[PDB]
Design a protein around this motif. Structure first.
Motif, PDB file in Angstrom:
ATOM      1  N   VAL A  54      -4.029  -1.595 -10.553  1.00  0.00           N
ATOM      2  CA  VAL A  54      -5.378  -1.383 -10.042  1.00  0.00           C
ATOM      3  C   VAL A  54      -6.277  -2.568 -10.376  1.00  0.00           C
ATOM      4  N   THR A  55      -6.036  -3.234 -11.507  1.00  0.00           N
ATOM      5  CA  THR A  55      -6.793  -4.429 -11.858  1.00  0.00           C
ATOM      6  C   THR A  55      -6.338  -5.660 -11.084  1.00  0.00           C
ATOM      7  N   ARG A  56      -5.260  -5.550 -10.309  1.00  0.00           N
ATOM      8  CA  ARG A  56      -4.687  -6.637  -9.519  1.00  0.00           C
ATOM      9  C   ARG A  56      -4.236  -7.816 -10.374  1.00  0.00           C
ATOM     10  N   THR A  67      -2.305   8.090  -7.151  1.00  0.00           N
ATOM     11  CA  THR A  67      -1.851   7.961  -5.770  1.00  0.00           C
ATOM     12  C   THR A  67      -0.330   7.897  -5.702  1.00  0.00           C
ATOM     13  N   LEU A  91       0.815  -1.208   0.000  1.00  0.00           N
ATOM     14  CA  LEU A  91       0.000   0.000   0.000  1.00  0.00           C
ATOM     15  C   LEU A  91       0.851   1.261   0.000  1.00  0.00           C
ATOM     16  N   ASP A  92       0.367   2.279  -0.708  1.00  0.00           N
ATOM     17  CA  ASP A  92       0.968   3.600  -0.640  1.00  0.00           C
ATOM     18  C   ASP A  92       0.597   4.285   0.672  1.00  0.00           C
ATOM     19  N   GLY A 110      -6.762  -7.663  -0.468  1.00  0.00           N
ATOM     20  CA  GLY A 110      -6.705  -7.074  -1.789  1.00  0.00           C
ATOM     21  C   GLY A 110      -5.406  -6.375  -2.112  1.00  0.00           C
ATOM     22  N   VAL A 137      -0.996  -2.052  -5.791  1.00  0.00           N
ATOM     23  CA  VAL A 137      -2.346  -1.951  -6.343  1.00  0.00           C
ATOM     24  C   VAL A 137      -2.874  -0.526  -6.356  1.00  0.00           C
ATOM     25  N   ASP A 138      -2.093   0.443  -5.883  1.00  0.00           N
ATOM     26  CA  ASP A 138      -2.497   1.840  -5.926  1.00  0.00           C
ATOM     27  C   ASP A 138      -2.393   2.383  -7.350  1.00  0.00           C
ATOM     28  N   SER A 139      -3.183   3.417  -7.628  1.00  0.00           N
ATOM     29  CA  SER A 139      -3.198   4.020  -8.951  1.00  0.00           C
ATOM     30  C   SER A 139      -1.978   4.913  -9.149  1.00  0.00           C
TER      31      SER A 139
END
Lengths: 197, 197, 197, 197, 197, 197, 197, 197, 197, 197
Positions: free
Chosen positions: B106-108, B81, B44-45, B122, B76-78
């Motif tokens: 983002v689509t994982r 972000t 995560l960011d 996630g 998974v951050d955009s």
């Protein structure tokens, strides 16, 4: 991509006959509740990178037992092959006396359960797995065959997970014992970020 | 051993939008044919272990590029972000300017293809992967969330694999440049074993 | 076409971490029994239409709480990205202080349960769902990405559903508080149609 | 999100008999390629909210056609029931002369394809769908039966989607003709955020 | 060929909203335990053959009621459409006041269960069904749309089935009240045959 | 509604050995292209309602043939039993000389194809079918065993369908040759309605 | 190849209406517990080989009953056709009075359970079955249609199976009452073989 | 009615090693095209009814060949057991010299294909089958083990089917060469019935 | 009878790395076309019965080669374990120098293909297979682990199969070179049986 | 590859009619609990290799019984053929009087359970099986048909398994009574290896 070793979940159980101090002994995961376990696979006895890793892990076995962590090597070779390799001088490519158990995965059950079986040769990749006292898999490290692993890093990781286990903080990149940790929440973490930047 | 990530086989392809020198640009595995790739996932960011790892790899990015190895981070951050985090000062837990791309998953799909998606949250575990110039996966490293990885160990592994690629020898445990390597056959390996024992 | 959001049936349950008044808090649908809920999804933090919708609802938040209706925003971004966006000034594209909760759907479970996930990008469409005090879904509104929603219309709908909930009459097109309603039966309905034609 | 009705995808094709200027005629979605389309379902002829929505849209049909948008009403009732209702004075709960087609979905296929069928009664929920000139679905609105829709909001949405189509900007929350739009990239978006904060 | 209507078996249960004396009332087969039932389907309200059949059965309703037989009409139109048709004068193609219930089958459940649904249009064929007081189906009549049924024949059949129920005799072709019947056994049937030939 | 017998669809094809003018001869549906067909099933030879139906149709066969309609009887009995029955005096329960073919459905294929087989007994119910000159099924009539059919109603139905086939109008309830028909459109149908009401 | 009639196993149960001494009576296989049963199927009433078989078995019926064996005929014709045939003189191809039951297998179940149904014609092949007092099938005889069976052989077989049941010996080829039998063991069987060779 | 053995259908093909005039020889069904075949299975060599049947057929073999019919015996015993039995004198329960082939069904394929395999013991029932020159099965005969068959009835049947094959007439009950036949049609059969009653 | 190993059919193909004269060499069944092969599996290197069998075959290797037969040993151990065992003196439990290839089957494919894998241990039973010059499996011998096989018997069987391969006679029980063979037919076999009895 | 005979597991249970001392008797594996069993299959009675193996085993039957081991012969031939072969003199190819049971596997169940059935011929290969007193299968020997087995090797194997059963040591290659055995552990096995090398 194969097997059942998943971070954060119970490590796959295993039982196997191992060579402990020149003798044969059953070795099961349940024997290590409350203790950390570094389980490391290797392809073949009487080969080349293999002895250097097993020896390197044996020499420093007590560094891990000083922390409460037992080290276990394993390959698809039988206990008789393990014993024979142990009774071979290190000058000859042998292991010599050994301070760590050497498990025999002759059914390939362990290598398949941990997803490290190189299927086209029937041998295990250089897979290293760190299991905590609660039986939960915490770290996965798999090397292709021509490059050996690092006992320094395996110790660093064991130390790291034990620290965060007791003190509820997280270990930054490159954390060795004595380095600052981070309190994992937005407010308390500013202490660390303002100090180190 | 990670989703579609199998050592010895082609690394799972990927294409993603990334932040590169403060701007959005496409990044694909195909851009690095002929070069080694160190691909490291992070959960995560705007969290805690995460910035220390991303900064550590960015600071050492050129050490990898001299070896012909490119470092790519991904979560998974955009990309939006990512950019906000890059535009946050390190004193505040930000990343500051970076010397490595930061891919957006983002689509994982990237996380799932590399089998590192902590399904119940996630987000991606701390999965790191080394790919060679031929697109083959050579090394899998996955940590649980509370412990950062080691840039020094990642650099050692890249160097070891580049050495075995070029000289057809294998690298002992803990090998580092200048250390002795083994000739992997029964006859020529005795040179090494007798020397060091 | 996807998901479980069916009008006239119980709204799909959800449980999420949210940023409430600068801190992280768990948010359940069960927390809102007896109260109406406007749940509005948006694609991505640190983008363009998104901040205007969140700020608009946040500003009008009491217009809804006066009617006993809570407003909840949600995206697949994490609570850490949400907070960083809240701590960015509105003049720079940020949210600034917020009067509504901002939920994190990092598992995409809410977006899938409400059938608003843009699968090819992994982000939520501009889905807005009106839920009554009994947990029943009463309204669905979903905008493609480039067009923002209307807070006025959302409020008009909340007011109309509570009115019909309370009085059993039905609201004509364009109904706003103080406009005539219709008694839904063949005989009484003629009161309305004689007056308005 | 509606049966086969998915935002960003081609709207489900339909073919149906309709009442057009007091006469029966076949109506197809493909007949409107190149124009915008507002398709609104409604449950039953000779009821209460229903005539107010149909009348409202009919009255304002030319306001949509000035924008190149055709309006179509649909219900499961037949064309003979539609015609008898059109031939019923508005003072008496009827529709009087209509300026919009009125399609008969006697097979319920249109309602099933657009996912608005209330199966326990066999009638359509108050589902409205905005389709662009390319035949792509851009907006989904569905109300429970007691509450009518807003023709103003449908018009605002058609305007907004046509604005973003032509210019490539995006419409903030509440946008009407004569409001500021946002340029959807990080740098150009700053023009808007400093003007309005 | 479709549905569940089989001679000699329990007629498919049904429950529907109906227009009964200008008011809406639930009607169900179990209401008619012990009485004969004539259930006739017709395609569409506000059409052409339809009103003449509905009027003809309504006028003869008491002829059936004197025999303990209740007549029921049904189509897929809603009860509101039925009622609006009843309130249309017969001179204008309406029904006028009626003496029989008019069931609304908006879910098409009755039509499907009785196998009379013209699928390509969603309307019922001219299926008529006679059900005895035990709930068992005795007669099936289905006409294509352009030809109406005969009320005289329906009454004749109800009379015939009631006569055979009681006396255990069988009714020759064209039988009416007063005609000779046959005792269905080889020896006693010779009474009819020798007299009538 | 019977097996493969569907109103408005091509009648199920049939091929049978039949007794014709006292001799055996093959009969098939394709023989009657361009002519209407009345195909009536009956359960069993040498019983009671059966001969009265067969004799009634045979006596009036020419009334159908003048209309270009051929009447065919069919039962599961063999042609040898049909012929023994034809050779039995009518005073004794026989048929005597016949003016219509009597088909032998010994395989039960016709009764199964027309959905009239009483499975628990292996005999056909009193199913009657009207097929037009184009091979399309127009009318289904099935009686329980104790009650015979009406040759009058079958002739009326044939006349009605032939009338609607030729003139495009529709036959009201109880229509007989000479009665008024309805033009099936909203405007032209008013001639009939105002006249007869 | 089809059905359930298997020698050495319980004969398939049967239950049918039959013609017995000019009247209709039910007949079940359990009626014959303790007695032998000769069950012979035949294709069609009012045919050609059929009457000669039925008559032969009828005239010889008492020769079977003197031995405790009941003969039963069966075909797919109804009991009414059976009786009609019985009431037809033998000089005209009829059966005249019968001394055996004539079962009616209108459902074709008996023919199916005994696997003698000629499927393409729906009639029974000339299948004859000998069931013993315990309900066990002992003999199967099936002829193609153009060739009748032998009552003499059927009687010989009933006598033979009754001899082996009683005395435990076994009957040679061509055995008739009075002929020698064999004791079925190696040593005692030599009494027969020495005698007859 | 036996495995794949169906009357009126091609006899199941078979090929087997057989003893023929003291020597082994392959025997196929296709060898007998154009000739009739009597194929009789029997359970076991060196038993009791078995030799009497085999000797009876062997002695009459030429009576069949004079008709163009070849007799074949078969059992599951091998051809070496068949020969040993043939080399055993008849006084000792042997066969002695043989004028018919003896087939060896060691794979049990013939018994299974002809549905005569007594499964619980692995041997064949006394199944006799008559096959015409066209390869078509005409007659099935199966006795339980204790009772032998009749070579006289087998010859009668062969004569009967050959007769009906040539002349197209049918053979009454108990027909033998010299007896009357019936012309199988209603008119011509009267010759036979009036002559014989 | 062994996985894919069946007497009389082609032996399972195999390809493996073997130790041949102190070096590593590939071995495949195709190399031995035109030569007999004795392929003997054994459980584990560095065990107890195992070396005695390998040494016994190595000592007699030329005895098989004079007969055109090559002997091959195989276990799941690797070629490196094989070589280590070969370089261990026999007095120590080693193999010493060898005159037969020692195949490595670490994928267990050879053991699984020959159905000799003791599944619960992952090692091969003492399975010996004799393969003829044309690659057909002639003999299977599998011992439980405690009991060693007999090289004498293996040589006797190779001699036997080569003799029968050449002269088309069969080898009695206990046949050794010099002993009489039997001509396998009824007549010519009598020479043998009369001589030796 | 087929069947259920697995070394180390319970031998497939069997039950069969057998010839014992010239009389028929049931034999079953449970009868030999506590005793070793040599069960040898052979293809066919009255052949060539077969009598030599049966006679050889019969002659040596007491040598096996002195060890507590029973010998059983089994083929698919019936007991009546077994007895006939026994009553044939050995000079003529017969078996003469025997001292071992001969089982009849007429159902092929035993041959199929032990995986020795040569399906294409329906006969058993020369499969020999050694079962210990506990019912466990210890040895499998299968020969192609033209080569007989060795009664000497079978006796040797029984002795070796009974020795290992009793003394826990293991038998080397070629072990016969009196020869030295091996103590199966690394340390104690050295006794054997130094002595004999």
């Amino acid at each position: 991509a194969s097997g059942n070793a998943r971070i954060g979940k119970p490590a796959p159980d295993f039982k196997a006959t191992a060579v402990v101090d020149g003798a044969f002994k059953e070795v099961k995961l349940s024997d290590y509740k409350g203790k950390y376990v570094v389980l490391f696979f290797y392809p073949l006895d009487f080969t080349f990178v293999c002895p250097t890793e097993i020896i390197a892990f044996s020499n420093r076995a007590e560094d891990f037992r000083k922390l409460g962590c037992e080290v276990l090597g394993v390959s698809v070779d039988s206990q008789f092959t393990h014993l024979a390799w142990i009774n071979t001088p290190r000058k000859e490519g042998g292991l010599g006396p050994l301070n760590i158990p050497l498990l025999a995965d002759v059914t390939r059950r362990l290598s398949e359960d941990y997803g490290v079986l190189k299927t086209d040769e029937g041998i295990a990749y250089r897979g290293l797995f760190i299991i905590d006292g609660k039986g939960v898999l915490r770290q996965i490290t798999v090397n292709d065959l021509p490059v050996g692993r690092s006992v320094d890093e395996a110790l660093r990781l064991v130390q790291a997970f034990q620290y965060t286990d007791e003190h509820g903080e997280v270990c930054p990149a490159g954390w060795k014992p004595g380095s600052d940790t981070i309190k994992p929440n937005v407010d308390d973490s500013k202490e660390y970020f303002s100090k180190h930047n």
